[PDB]
Design a protein around this ligand. Structure first.
Ligand SMILES: [Cl-]
Ligand SMILES: [Cl-]
Ligand SMILES: [Cl-]
Ligand SMILES: [Cl-]
Ligand SMILES: [Cl-]
Ligand SMILES: [Cl-]
Ligand SMILES: [Mg+2]
Lengths: 244, 244, 244, 244
């Protein structure tokens, strides 16, 4: 499983900031054995893709569930590809919570993105309430069951897990908690899809990884890389790419 | 009130289709007394702005309610301006219905778009159900009260009204019912904001307007222009801009 | 209403026969006051369009209701446009009878072809059984009601009426029966859509029309042209185009 | 039995997408021991055949049951051959389900395509309601008996089996389920046609095959190749052709 790092710029960049990040990533010595991608706002996809090293992917942060139509404010996988970009993040925790996107909606998006030839970073997450009530496994099973019902080509999927109780709360997940969550996800794939898919699907930890903790975290069992928010905007992203 | 036409491309264009529309609009003999704008998918804002005559505006089809932050899949007025575009459509009926955007959410967007210096096409709509339950006044007044609370500079706002019951139900809106809906909005502004605002604010009809019915609708008493979808992709958009 | 003649080649041509027909139509003296179109098999659309005079349109004989997807054997309006063609025939009596296409199916096709910017020849028909049971008004009203629910841009629609009891039966419709049916359709548009649409929409007679009866039928009050089958394969199509 | 791969583009391509797929397939190092075909929309048959290496066949995705006639929207094997294409897919599960094509209709098409000298990819399928109830043998034998009655020249036929219950419920058929079904089909040929026909007829699996599982599935007993949809639009089609 090739080490995989995606830096999600969320709604935190403009053209000037992207130019600086892209120049930094273009100039740095990057581990050739890491597959690196950046998550870019829809309005900057073409700009980012034209300037960034072609070996680094560019992902839209969301898309809709059909190729065309009367859906003001939405973009399709077909339009992302038209901007030169191969990747899309689907089911991001911010869409699931702030925008209340249901699992069935995300599944419709994943299914169409797959038909369009996209590569997908599909996100899983558990809330503070989920973890306190002991529903971690229940929520992950439900989210995975929904995703797997929409996926026909697992080779073009990467999965990311975020513990929302560890995002700007004053608490981080322990190494054991991270390893146990990703081991649960891999065992789900093994038992409900196939051993081949379990053994080849990259599982990411989405959390507060940075220069100071990435090498430690990159050695965790069942971890294949990272989905990073704030470190994507900083030199830390180079160290994370280089964590192995 | 300066005649105003916005052609909304929705999710129906790619870069090649935009290139054809933009060439057509750049080359067309457009009435200098019409203010013309196109509604453009977020991923093509910069492309459209860079290729479209500067005298024609470019509108994003949606935006979020703050300038920046951890909002995957959203863009801000500040980012739209960073793409060189001055306009944003807010409260479009497709967002109100398909995406269930409540008035209070649209209000937050309109307020921050006002703060950011955007020009806004703020949309009103009456559903088929609203028409049959006889609550047209009730729903339109609630929508307007919400918008007006979020607007302190009406010079940068245009209002658009869609009768959702007038598209693909078998029932067609007469010129009389269009004029009457627009006069209702205008008098609400007279009663609840100011007569100066009512006299100066452009009120648009959003509906099935094309080369065949546009000259007749452009002469309705309280109509100041059009928000059009399908015709925006056809040569009709020039005839609509030139409807007077 | 500009005189309109469409020659439908149905499934009666190969490349060689198309070359013969196209050569004949290209060289013939055609009335410039007539809008001429040919109905062409899907596999020959590009060939017909690249060889036919730019003055004469090319129409596919059918299409599906979405732009793309997992629909083996179907083509979309977007693919027809990609072949350089502007027109599609929808609801042809052969598809309503042999292929049992229901009104609601044809309505989805018309609505999507409209969204895609096609020009449409939408067909109505009464069967021998309908006429025998005195249900002529009933079936035409039902078909019209369905089509009207799907049309937003009447400027891009032509309607054609076929009396199937006049097709390879040994009975022809009289000129009086044709005028009565077309006047029925035009008054339905007056009553249920608008006077302006009734005034401007071309109504065609689909039936056995050839050199010997085209001038007489072309003088019928509510007839605006012809949807021709067998004469489209013969020099007669030139006389029909020139019937006024 | 020569390994056989058909990549069905369904209704998912335009001329641009074909040109990229065709250049990729043209430039690839393809196993000369694989017979490769692509399934092409009717309106692009000539375009695909004219741009594709002669080593790769081109199949229409459907046709009608006679050579010519008053059948708007239909094409014949004779017309497909006139476009230079040798193959036709008949009985595709999308035609059997979405378009409700009955076995008797499919047999009329197969018999006429045989008369016309076509090569045929004839499809079988088991729906969700079929795997449940357990009618695997009975409905498949109905489809097979119908195809066999319409075939006098098996050298020009390939059979494809789709477990529609898999794709439609979002799961994958096991390798034992695939081998069981193809062994079932071949044993039916052995007992009801001839040993020589069972021994020489290529049986394909129609399902979600991609670069990750194609080598595994290509080694399955009684499997002679693949009918693939989504992977035909991706570089995976090269890996599938080369899976042996
Ligand atoms: Cl990319
Ligand atoms: Cl993130
Ligand atoms: Cl602008
Ligand atoms: Cl609109
Ligand atoms: Cl044309
Ligand atoms: Cl009347
Ligand atoms: Mg008053």
């Amino acid at each position: 499983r090739k080490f995989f790092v995606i830096g999600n710029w969320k709604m935190n960049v403009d053209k000037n900031r992207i130019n600086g990040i892209v120049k930094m990533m273009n100039k740095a010595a990057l581990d050739p054995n890491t597959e690196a991608v950046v998550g870019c706002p829809s309005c900057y996809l073409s700009h980012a893709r034209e300037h960034l090293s072609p070996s680094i992917g560019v992902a839209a942060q969301n898309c809709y569930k059909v190729a065309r139509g009367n859906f003001s404010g939405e973009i399709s996988p077909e339009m992302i590809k038209d901007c030169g970009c191969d990747w899309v993040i689907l089911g991001h925790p911010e869409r699931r919570t702030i925008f209340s996107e249901p699992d069935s909606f995300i599944a419709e998006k994943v299914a169409h993105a797959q038909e369009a030839g996209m590569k997908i970073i599909a996100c899983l997450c558990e809330t503070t309430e989920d973890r306190k009530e002991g529903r971690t496994k229940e929520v992950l099973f439900k989210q995975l069951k929904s995703l797997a019902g929409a996926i026909r080509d697992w080779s073009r999927v990467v999965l990311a897990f975020e513990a929302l109780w560890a995002s700007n709360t004053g608490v981080f997940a322990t190494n054991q908690q991270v390893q146990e969550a990703l081991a649960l996800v891999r065992d789900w794939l093994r038992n409900n899809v196939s051993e081949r898919v379990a053994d080849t699907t990259r599982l990411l930890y989405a959390g507060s990884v940075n220069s100071g903790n990435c090498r430690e975290m990159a050695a965790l069992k069942d971890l294949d890389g990272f989905l990073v928010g704030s470190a994507a905007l900083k030199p830390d992203i180079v160290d994370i790419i280089n964590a192995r």
